[PDB]
Design a protein around this ligand. Structure first.
Ligand SMILES: [Ca+2]
Ligand SMILES: [Ca+2]
Lengths: 109, 83
């Protein structure tokens, strides 16, 4: 994976969890970040785009940011339905194509 | 702003990611290529029963570099024509 994500995390309901991703000047440094959510046994879906916008239908408990070569997805009030794998995506100007993180699992206690 | 352009680009990245996961389901090796053997396993998970030569022929129709196996970009061309 060209992007590197923060390690998988376990947290209790109502906790704040922040997943981070780290890239390079040519990808996250120059292009906006999308977040993809894959719930257990479901297809991956778009969760956030343009760094900080919610995809249609997505809970406003999610927020995103981008600074330099880093980006982050915050889940403010963690709930059972958030148990999932989260992937970062962006464009890479040097590879002329989409690049991805290796995913971060959120497990809720 | 360019609201619809940004959203449509994001959905393109989600479509590529979805193909990456599909590729991974073919590439049960994880070696980054789809062989006749792996393609055959997927085709028979569907109802189908191709010969090894027919599987090679499916490969050859998208084999751009000519190494006799399918890599991710060639897989994208194969899915383009199907979809
Ligand atoms: Ca393989
Ligand atoms: Ca090939």
């Amino acid at each position: 994976p060209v992007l590197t994500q923060s390690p998988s995390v376990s947290a209790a309901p109502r906790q704040r969890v922040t997943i981070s991703v780290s890239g390079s000047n040519s990808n996250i440094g120059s292009n906006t970040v999308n977040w993809i959510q894959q719930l257990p046994g479901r297809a991956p879906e778009l969760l956030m785009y343009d760094d900080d916008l919610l995809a249609p239908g997505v809970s406003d408990r999610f927020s995103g940011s981008r600074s330099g070569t880093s980006a982050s997805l915050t889940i403010s009030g963690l709930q059972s339905e958030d148990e999932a794998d989260y992937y970062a995506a962006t464009w890479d100007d040097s590879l002329n194509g989409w690049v991805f993180g290796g995913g971060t699992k959120v497990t809720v206690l | 702003g360019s609201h619809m352009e940004k959203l449509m680009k994001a959905f393109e990245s989600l479509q590529i990611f979805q193909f990456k996961e599909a590729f991974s389901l073919f590439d049960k090796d994880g070696d980054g290529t789809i062989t006749t053997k792996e393609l055959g396993t997927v085709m028979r998970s569907l109802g189908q029963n191709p010969t090894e030569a027919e599987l090679q022929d499916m490969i050859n129709e998208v084999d751009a570099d000519g190494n006799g196996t399918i890599d991710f970009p060639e897989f994208l061309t194969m899915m383009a024509r199907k979809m």
